[PDB]
Design a protein around this ligand. Structure first.
Ligand SMILES: CC(C)c1ccc2c(c1)S(=O)(=O)N=C(Nc1ccc(C(=O)O)cc1)N2
Ligand SMILES: CC(C)c1ccc2c(c1)S(=O)(=O)N=C(Nc1ccc(C(=O)O)cc1)N2
Lengths: 139, 135
């Protein structure tokens, strides 16, 4: 199975823990290594940005499931979720209310509670939640 | 024509862009209840589905989608994602915060453009955009 992942210290350690657990269920498609540097270059890196955008789109279409950590506001994560919905992907969004953030009503409103789910979680149970998600509906 | 639009300086600029957009057609935009609905969390999922449906209907009705993308936002990103899949004409305005490489990368320079701007010229830039490709 193929899994697409998109997403301070708490956020980054949870991204690492989610990706590590997703690797138990199939091949994880995720990449963020150049995003900060491409972004810092602005309009001058538009060419490289178009390449990474095409790559993320091909991975979203290949994916059997899209998983997003939606705690921190992000235009990139929101965009990839919009494209994933139009591709009718199975999607799981994970949001941590204890971060102080308010999750966008648009993201909570896009979830139907079946094909697209949004789950609130506490940092300590994210592995157990992913095991629950994939046992109740295996890939 | 129908146009869809998605701190202190940012709020003034959203108001200036919407005011100028009304010269080119009917402007579809709403955020009156978004903060309150969002703060309610899972308890307001029902109301959230209703506003999600309304925004999708407006994105489909729109002849052009305009977004101010200076501040990171999942909702704005999601609406741009849906707009791209609906193959809408899109203009993103960014004020050099650093803009996501994903949004710059989604632009093709034609049907979806990302324009960097300075606060003082935002009205003249909207005039330019609609004179070069009128609605
Ligand atoms: C072939 C290389 C190694 C590569 C392939 C794909 C990607 C990258 C590099 S990247 O430049 O590191 N970034 C992404 N995707 C992004 C996802 C989200 C955001 C955001 O939230 O703003 C930004 C970028 N894909
Ligand atoms: C007039 C009725 C009550 C109504 C119709 C449509 C909408 C609303 C109210 S609203 O609750 O004010 N918000 C939205 N759209 C949103 C756009 C962006 C975000 C975000 O960035 O998090 C959230 C919501 N549409």
């Amino acid at each position: 199975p193929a899994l697409y992942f998109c997403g301070g210290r708490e956020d980054r350690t949870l991204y690492e823990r989610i990706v590590s657990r997703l690797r138990r269920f199939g091949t994880v498609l995720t990449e963020h290594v150049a995003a900060a540097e491409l972004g810092a270059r602005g309009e001058e890196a538009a060419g490289g940005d178009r390449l990474i955008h095409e790559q993320d789109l091909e991975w979203l279409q290949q994916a059997d499931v899209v998983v997003a950590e939606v705690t921190q506001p992000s235009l990139g994560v929101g965009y990839e979720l919009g494209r994933a919905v139009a591709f009718n992907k199975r999607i799981l969004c994970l949001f941590r209310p204890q971060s102080g953030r308010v999750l966008s009503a648009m993201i909570r409103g896009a979830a139907d509670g079946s094909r697209f789910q949004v789950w609130d979680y506490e940092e300590g149970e994210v592995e157990a939640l992913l095991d629950r998600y994939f046992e109740a509906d295996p890939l």
